[PDB]
């Protein structure tokens, strides 16, 4: 520690020069300026372009995240403008770059302190464009950020959320079965978790849509729908009490046939959430006595202690 | 605008020979089905509802009617309209109903109640008679053909004078290449209806076509039974009217140029009503082969994202509607205006002078009407006008200035300090 | 002046 | 068969719309034959049903449900039945001035399986279906998010046949002028840029398609410029509309 006040200073008098001058050296300067104990912003703002002239995945990912971290040291409006410029340029690098992980890293770099910058529609449109991507995780980040912005900008974001809900339901009802269907059910779950304010008005439509999926026949898809139902129970609370009977019947039918389905843990957890959130805690063992065996027999058959 | 012409080319519901229509093509007119009544009522009640529906727009206007115009009734009507409105505009309506469809010449077919008893009238004659400026409403099966014909003949008049045109407004149902489709759900006078009761018409169209479960329990029976006077905000109709006008004016101010917006939507009540309803009807009517047509150079306002909020304003309001009608439930005020004022405050909170200016200044203009949201709007304006001088000038350009000026005729001395503060900044 | 009714 | 049916068709042709006097009597049985007859003559009957559709259009509205059902049941991607079904789809789009949107979602899950199954060298199965999708126009306002991914995957592949490459690029261009693709802009332009550095056969084509998108995006197109141009410069590729539009955009003067 005793030499740090010198060593880092010396490194700066190198690193700054290496930031100006070279793609490899500038990449090193970025990576080692971010990771280390330094105290440059104008240099990183232009090195954001210089690290791009490279074909290495790790360089792109780590240097993008490092430029994101470095350009937010102290945020003020000038810092907001600089970070917005460079992060938009990195999102443009995202569309230039077919790599999923680089795009995910760039989008996840968006710290919550810049939410005010995203409050304006001129900047929320960038997130709505980010929703228009082919990768699940990027769209998950976009939904989370947009739903967080829902606290501030209803006039801008409410139609976005409604359009996404309608689109996702249409995709689930029309796009057929596949990995994309599982991703779509997960998308609806993320939208529900991040948008309780809209789903609560529209709980009955979305709940009917979710119920019909399970009542139709597809492992994973049924699992995503079931987890989404449990999440809706968490969000809604007492609203689903009228449906608790049918929902418990469906889930117990699954658990009895758990030997033929994936993630019985999800169904058990879903019953727990449903009864805990709706208040049906003691009716089922009278209405549905068999559960008194199952919850006990599960402890002598299933070998996963989780 | 002075005077209005109501030209009724009704051959007592007799179909033309040049069409062969399906069984559910007995489409009403003016919410009246003339096929169930004879000439004395099939021709009269339509005119009665036209008169009522248009007095609802401007009762002051000199309304004149012409049922079964043959030759001389046309000339007397348009001559009288010229005399009353030698310099001002003259509104002029069409239906194109009855026996054979409107043609390029401008004929009428109501001479002696027959397919063959037609009259070779000319558009050039009417344009010569209408030497003054003019407004036209073409609600026809081939209304775009009539628009193209009228543009060409008005251009002919302009060429003849150079070797009324260039001060003309035209609105129409469809394009010349696209006839009105045989949709039973629509009334026959589609373009008269949609510009007349746009609220319930848009509600019905979306209830039929927006195949979404977001608003369960709402059907067309409820839409036909909504209480309200389009200004009584205690019912859905007043709130929906206010919100729809606010949305349309906001999108037009954001999108349309100032040279046309500041004249069409400000210098005449009926022109503003027709154009607002026309943009909403355009959003409805583009969905099928009924491409609307218009005279002024107006970009496609329907594409604007704020129209999505329109659906939300519907989605909330209709969610209350089944008990508003059946159970008489008092309407709950929509959060639309509060949300948009929050958006205005968000733009203010950005603290940047030269982003794109606030899109919600027309919303503020139409929120200064009533106290319950005018107070928030006035506080927001006080915050806004402390920005650079552009914030002042734009407040004059939007049209907020006349409304705040009008608000400075009240006796609310508890409110006057804020109003004088704001008005002192707007006039700077 | 105004195109709407105002609480004035 | 062809001696009877054609005569009826000829009479209907000679009657035009006047054949509506007989359609309540004839068409219910005619459709029944389509459900019962052998496939080889079933295709010919589908073609003659298309002829009748072209004849009358709106007057077979009450029969359109059964027509769509019959089309969907026998949709097995056979080249003959596929071309016949596409002809019927185009004819029904012409007939349905404002009601095709109520029958399009009935066809989407049967179209999504066409693109992502066939791998023939530019077979008519995909190309003529893409032409049909071009013909839809404004009806794709609430459904392009369903059909766009497989259409994109046709040219996105590295070994796409040239008919499958120009198609889904000319198709995007033709739909671009009438539809707003701002929401779909990323998912469209990025996989197009993936193929700009591929074979020269598309050098103009994709760029021409991009030109239309450019005109709609304007200022927004300054997220696609560094992606698109830096791959275009890898080869000698130009397009005058694209060049003048980009000059206008960067200059900020689009008049």
DSSP of D55-104:
HHGGGGGGGHHHHHHHHHHT----HHHHHHHHHHHHHHHHH-SS-GGGTS
- CB contact (8 A) between residue B287 and residue D18: no
Mutate to test the interface with B, among D12, D96, D97 (most CBs of B within 10 A): D97
Please, are residues A146 and A107 in contact by the beta-carbon 8 Å criterion? no
Interface size, chain B vs chain C, as Cβ–Cβ contacts under 8 Å: 30
State how far the Cα of B332 lies from the Cα of B339, in Å rounded to an integer: 15
State how far the Cα of A19 lies from the Cα of C7, in Å rounded to an integer: 63
- B-chain CB neighbours of C3 within 8 Å are 265-266, 269, 272
State how far the Cα of A85 lies from the Cα of B233, in Å rounded to an integer: 45
The resolution of the experimental structure, rounded to one decimal in Å, is 4.0
Could you identify the residue written with the tokens 């394009």? B175
Nearest CA among A277, A276, A278, A256 for reference residue A267 = A256
- B-chain CB neighbours of C5 within 8 Å are 231, 369
**CB-CB: which of D18, D58, D138 is closest to B287?**
D138
In total, chain A counts a number of residues equal to 306
Q: In what order do the strands lie in the sheet with B134-138?
A: B62-67, B3-8, B90-94, B134-138, B168-172, B293-294
The strand pair at B134-138 and B3-8 is best described as unpaired
Q: D17 and chain B: CB distance < 8 Å anywhere?
A: yes
- Give the DSSP letter of residue B231: S
- Give the DSSP letter of residue B153: H
Could you identify the residue written with the tokens 């005729």? B409
Please, are residues B92 and B136 in contact by the beta-carbon 8 Å criterion? yes
Chain A contact residues (CB < 8 Å to B): 77, 116-117, 119-122, 152-156, 158-159, 162-163, 166, 201-202, 204-205, 208-209
Q: B309 and chain A: CB distance < 8 Å anywhere?
A: yes
Beta strands in B95-179 (DSSP E): 134-138, 168-172
Beta bridge partners of B63: B4
Please, are residues B106 and B60 in contact by the beta-carbon 8 Å criterion? no
Chains A and C touch (3+ CB pairs under 8 A): no
State how far the Cα of A191 lies from the Cα of A199, in Å rounded to an integer: 9
Q: D221 and chain A: CB distance < 8 Å anywhere?
A: no
Q: A92 and chain D: CB distance < 8 Å anywhere?
A: yes
Nearest CA among A111, A112, A113, A103 for reference residue A139 = A103
Please, are residues B381 and B364 in contact by the beta-carbon 8 Å criterion? yes
- CB contact (8 A) between residue A176 and residue D187: no
Residues ≥6 apart with Cβ < 8 Å to D245: D211, D214, D215, D254
Please, are residues B171 and B195 in contact by the beta-carbon 8 Å criterion? yes
Q: Give CA angle at D124 (D122, D130), nearest 5°.
A: 90
**CB-CB: which of A88, A129, A180 is closest to D186?**
A129
Q: Would you state the structure tokens that stand for residue B398, as one six-digit string?
A: 């939007």
- A-chain CB neighbours of D230 within 8 Å are 96
- CB contact (8 A) between residue A120 and residue B355: yes
- CB contact (8 A) between residue D186 and residue A133: yes
- Give the DSSP letter of residue B332: P
Please, are residues D147 and A170 in contact by the beta-carbon 8 Å criterion? no
Q: How many CB atoms lie within 10 A of CB B27?
A: 18
Q: At what angle do helices D39-56 and D2-15 cross, to 10 degrees?
A: 10
Q: D99 and chain B: CB distance < 8 Å anywhere?
A: yes
- CB contact (8 A) between residue B407 and residue C4: no
- CB contact (8 A) between residue B350 and residue A209: no
Beta bridge partners of B8: B67
- Give the DSSP letter of residue D20: G
Largest Cα–Cα distance in chain D?
A: 68
State how far the Cα of B95 lies from the Cα of B142, in Å rounded to an integer: 10
- D-chain CB neighbours of A177 within 8 Å are none
State how far the Cα of B202 lies from the Cα of B278, in Å rounded to an integer: 12
Please, are residues D9 and D44 in contact by the beta-carbon 8 Å criterion? no
- Grouping H, G, I as helix, E, B as strand and the rest as coil, residue B294 is strand
Q: Give CA angle at A39 (A33, A44), nearest 5°.
A: 45
State how far the Cα of A232 lies from the Cα of A131, in Å rounded to an integer: 22
Q: Report the gap between the CA of B353 and the closest CA in chain D (Å).
A: 20
CA A1 to chain centre: 39
CA distances for B75 relative to B97, B198, B243, angstroms: 20, 33, 42
The residues in D 128-157 lying below 8 A from B, measured between CB atoms, are 138, 141
Please, are residues A26 and A50 in contact by the beta-carbon 8 Å criterion? yes
- CB contact (8 A) between residue A176 and residue D109: yes
Q: How many CB atoms lie within 10 A of CB A31?
A: 18
Q: At what angle do helices A4-20 and A23-35 cross, to 10 degrees?
A: 150
Residues ≥6 apart with Cβ < 8 Å to D251: none
The residues in D 65-94 lying below 8 A from B, measured between CB atoms, are none
Q: How many CB atoms lie within 10 A of CB B323?
A: 12
The torsion of the CA quartet A246, A250, A253, A257, rounded to 10 degrees, works out to: 180
Please, are residues B63 and B55 in contact by the beta-carbon 8 Å criterion? yes
Buried residues in D66-91 as b, exposed as e (16+ CB within 10 A)? bbbebbeebbebeeebbbbbbbbbbb
- Grouping H, G, I as helix, E, B as strand and the rest as coil, residue B370 is coil
State how far the Cα of D207 lies from the Cα of D232, in Å rounded to an integer: 9
- Grouping H, G, I as helix, E, B as strand and the rest as coil, residue B168 is strand
CA distances for B419 relative to A227, B394, B405, B425, angstroms: 54, 18, 9, 10
The torsion of the CA quartet B95, B98, B102, B107, rounded to 10 degrees, works out to: -100
> Phi and psi of B31, rounded to 5°?
55, 30
Name the region of B109 (left: φ>0; alpha: ψ -120 to 50; beta: rest): alpha
Q: How many CB atoms lie within 10 A of CB A221?
A: 22
Please, are residues A63 and A27 in contact by the beta-carbon 8 Å criterion? yes
Interface size, chain B vs chain D, as Cβ–Cβ contacts under 8 Å: 31
Q: Report the gap between the CA of A231 and the closest CA in chain B (Å).
A: 20
Nearest CA among B63, B60, B36 for reference residue B49 = B63
* Residue D215, Cβ density class (10 Å: 0-12 exposed, 13-18 middle, ≥19 buried): middle
State how far the Cα of B356 lies from the Cα of B353, in Å rounded to an integer: 9
Minimum CA–CA partner of B186 in chain D: D98
Beta bridge partners of B6: B65
Could you identify the residue written with the tokens 């990323």? D186
**CB-CB: which of A77, A121, A154 is closest to B351?**
A77
Minimum CA–CA partner of A85 in chain D: D223
The torsion of the CA quartet D173, B284, D86, B24, rounded to 10 degrees, works out to: -160
Please, are residues A29 and A18 in contact by the beta-carbon 8 Å criterion? yes
Please, are residues A228 and A169 in contact by the beta-carbon 8 Å criterion? no
State how far the Cα of D16 lies from the Cα of D9, in Å rounded to an integer: 10
Minimum CA–CA partner of B22 in chain D: D59
Q: Would you state the structure tokens that stand for residue B88, as one six-digit string?
A: 């001002």
Mutate to test the interface with A, among D105, D110, D146 (most CBs of A within 10 A): D146
Q: Where are the alpha helices (DSSP H) in A178-263?
A: 179-194, 196-199, 203-215, 221-236, 244-256
- B-chain CB neighbours of D99 within 8 Å are 183, 288
Q: B303 and chain A: CB distance < 8 Å anywhere?
A: no
- Grouping H, G, I as helix, E, B as strand and the rest as coil, residue A181 is helix
> Phi and psi of B90, rounded to 5°?
-125, 120
The residues in B 273-312 lying below 8 A from D, measured between CB atoms, are 286-290, 303
Q: B350 and chain A: CB distance < 8 Å anywhere?
A: yes
- B-chain CB neighbours of A156 within 8 Å are 343, 346
Q: How was this structure determined?
A: cryo-EM
Please, are residues A212 and A229 in contact by the beta-carbon 8 Å criterion? no
State how far the Cα of B415 lies from the Cα of C4, in Å rounded to an integer: 20
- CB contact (8 A) between residue B20 and residue D18: yes
Minimum CA–CA partner of D183 in chain B: B305
- CB contact (8 A) between residue D190 and residue A167: no
CA distances for D177 relative to A275, D173, D217, D248, angstroms: 54, 7, 12, 18
State how far the Cα of B60 lies from the Cα of B49, in Å rounded to an integer: 17
Q: B264 and chain C: CB distance < 8 Å anywhere?
A: no
Q: Would you state the structure tokens that stand for residue B358, as one six-digit string?
A: 């606030």
- A-chain CB neighbours of B347 within 8 Å are 120
Minimum CA–CA partner of B372 in chain C: C7
Q: At what angle do helices D23-36 and D39-56 cross, to 10 degrees?
A: 150
């Amino acid at each position: 520690p005793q030499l740090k006040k010198d060593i880092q200073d010396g490194l700066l008098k190198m690193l700054s020069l290496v930031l100006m001058h070279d793609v490899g050296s500038i990449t090193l300067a970025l990576r080692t300026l971010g990771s280390f104990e330094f105290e440059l912003t104008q240099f990183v703002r232009h090195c954001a372009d210089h690290f791009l002239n490279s074909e290495h995945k790790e360089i792109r990912m780590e240097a993008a995240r490092t430029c994101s971290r470095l350009l937010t040291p102290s945020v003020s409006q000038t810092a907001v403008q600089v970070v917005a410029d460079v992060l938009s340029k990195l999102l443009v690098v995202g569309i230039t770059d077919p790599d999923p992980d680089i795009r995910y890293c760039v989008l996840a770099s968006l710290d919550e302190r810049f939410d005010a910058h995203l409050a304006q529609a001129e900047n929320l449109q960038a997130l709505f464009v980010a929703l228009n991507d082919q990768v699940f995780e990027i769209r998950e980040l976009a939904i989370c950020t947009v739903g967080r912005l829902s606290s501030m900008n209803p006039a801008f974001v409410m139609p976005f959320l409604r359009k996404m809900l309608i689109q996702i339901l249409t995709e689930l009802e029309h796009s057929g079965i596949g990995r994309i269907k599982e991703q779509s059910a997960r998308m609806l779950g993320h939208l529900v978790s991040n948008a309780p304010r809209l789903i609560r008005p529209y709980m009955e439509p979305i709940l009917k849509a979710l119920i019909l999926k399970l009542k139709d026949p597809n492992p994973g898809v049924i699992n995503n729908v079931l987890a989404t139902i449990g999440e809706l129970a968490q969000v809604s609370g007492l609203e689903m009490r009228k449906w608790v009977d049918e929902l418990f019947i469906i889930i117990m039918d699954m658990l009895q046939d758990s030997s033929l389905l994936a993630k019985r843990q999800v169904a058990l957890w879903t019953l727990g959430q449903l009864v805990a959130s709706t208040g049906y805690v003691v009716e089922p063992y009278r209405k549905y006595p068999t559960l008194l065996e199952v919850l006990l027999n599960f402890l002598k058959t299933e070998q996963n202690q989780g | 605008t002075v005077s209005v012409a109501l030209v009724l080319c009704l051959n007592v519901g007799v179909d033309p020979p040049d069409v062969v229509k399906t069984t559910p093509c007995a489409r009403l007119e003016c919410w009246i089905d003339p096929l169930s009544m004879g000439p004395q009522k099939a021709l009269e009640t339509i005119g009665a509802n036209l008169q009522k529906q248009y007095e609802n727009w401007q009762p002051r206007a000199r309304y004149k009617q012409s049922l079964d115009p043959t030759v001389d009734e046309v000339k007397k009507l348009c001559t009288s309209l010229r005399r009353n409105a030698k310099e001002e505009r003259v509104l002029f309506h069409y239906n194109g109903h009855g026996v054979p469809r409107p043609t390029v010449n401008g004929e009428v077919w109501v001479f002696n109640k027959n397919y063959t008893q037609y009259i070779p009238l000319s558009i050039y004659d009417l344009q010569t008679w209408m030497g003054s400026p003019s407004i036209f409403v073409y609600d026809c099966s081939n209304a775009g053909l009539i628009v193209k014909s009228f543009k060409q003949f008005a251009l002919q008049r302009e060429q003849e004078l150079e070797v009324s045109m260039k001060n003309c407004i035209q609105l129409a149902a469809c394009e010349a290449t696209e006839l009105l489709p045989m949709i039973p759900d629509l009334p026959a006078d589609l373009f008269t209806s949609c510009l007349t009761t746009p609220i319930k018409i848009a509600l019905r169209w979306f209830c039929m076509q927006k195949c979404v479960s977001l608003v369960p329990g709402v059907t067309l029976d409820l839409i036909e039974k909504i209480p309200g006077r389009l200004n009584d905000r205690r019912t859905p109709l007043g709130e929906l009217n206010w919100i729809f006008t606010a949305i349309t004016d906001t999108i037009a101010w954001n999108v349309l140029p100032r040279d046309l917006f500041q004249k069409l939507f400000r210098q005449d009540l009926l022109v503003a009503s027709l154009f607002r309803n026309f943009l909403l009807a355009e959003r409805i009517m583009r969905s099928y082969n009924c491409t609307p047509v218009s005279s002024p150079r107006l970009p496609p306002t329907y594409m604007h994202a704020m129209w999505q909020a329109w659906d939300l304003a519907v989605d909330i309001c209709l969610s209350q509607l089944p008990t508003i009608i059946e159970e008489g439930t008092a309407f709950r005020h929509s959060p639309f205006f509060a949300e948009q004022l929050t958006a205005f405050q968000v733009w203010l909170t950005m603290g940047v002078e030269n982003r794109n200016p606030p899109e919600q200044l027309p919303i503020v203009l139409q929120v200064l009407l009533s106290q319950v949201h005018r107070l928030r709007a006035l506080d927001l304006l006080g915050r806004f006008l402390d920005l650079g001088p552009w914030a002042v000038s734009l407040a004059l350009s939007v049209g907020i200035f006349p409304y705040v000026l009008k608000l400075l005729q009240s006796s609310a001395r508890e409110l006057r300090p804020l109003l004088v503060f704001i008005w002192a900044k707007i006039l700077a | 002046e105004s195109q709407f009714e105002m609480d004035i | 068969h062809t001696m009877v049916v054609q005569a009826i068709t000829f009479i209907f042709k000679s009657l035009g719309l006047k054949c509506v006097q007989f359609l309540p009597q004839v068409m219910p049985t005619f459709l029944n034959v389509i459900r019962v007859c052998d496939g080889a003559i079933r295709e010919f009957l589908f073609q003659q049903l298309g002829m009748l559709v072209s004849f009358v259009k709106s007057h077979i509205r009450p029969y359109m449900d059964e027509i769509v059902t019959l089309m969907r049941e026998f949709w097995v991607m056979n080249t003959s039945i596929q071309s016949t079904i596409i002809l019927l789809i185009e004819q029904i789009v012409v007939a349905l001035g404002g009601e095709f949107k109520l029958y399009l979602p009935q066809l989407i899950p049967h179209m999504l399986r066409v693109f992502m199954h066939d791998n023939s060298p530019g077979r008519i199965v995909s190309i003529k279906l893409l032409a049909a999708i071009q013909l839809f126009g404004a009806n794709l306002d609430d459904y392009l998010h369903l059909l766009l991914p497989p259409i994109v995957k046709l040219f996105d592949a590295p070994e796409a046949p040239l008919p499958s490459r120009k198609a889904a690029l000319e198709t995007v261009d033709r739909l671009t002028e009438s539809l707003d693709f701002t929401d779909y802009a990323s998912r469209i332009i990025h996989p197009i840029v993936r193929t700009l550095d591929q074979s020269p056969e598309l050098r103009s084509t994709a760029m021409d398609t991009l030109s239309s998108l450019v005109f709609q995006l304007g200022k927004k197109y300054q997220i696609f410029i560094p992606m698109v141009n830096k791959v275009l410069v890898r080869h000698r590729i130009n397009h005058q509309r694209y060049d003048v539009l980009i000059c206008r955009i960067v200059k900020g003067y689009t008049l």
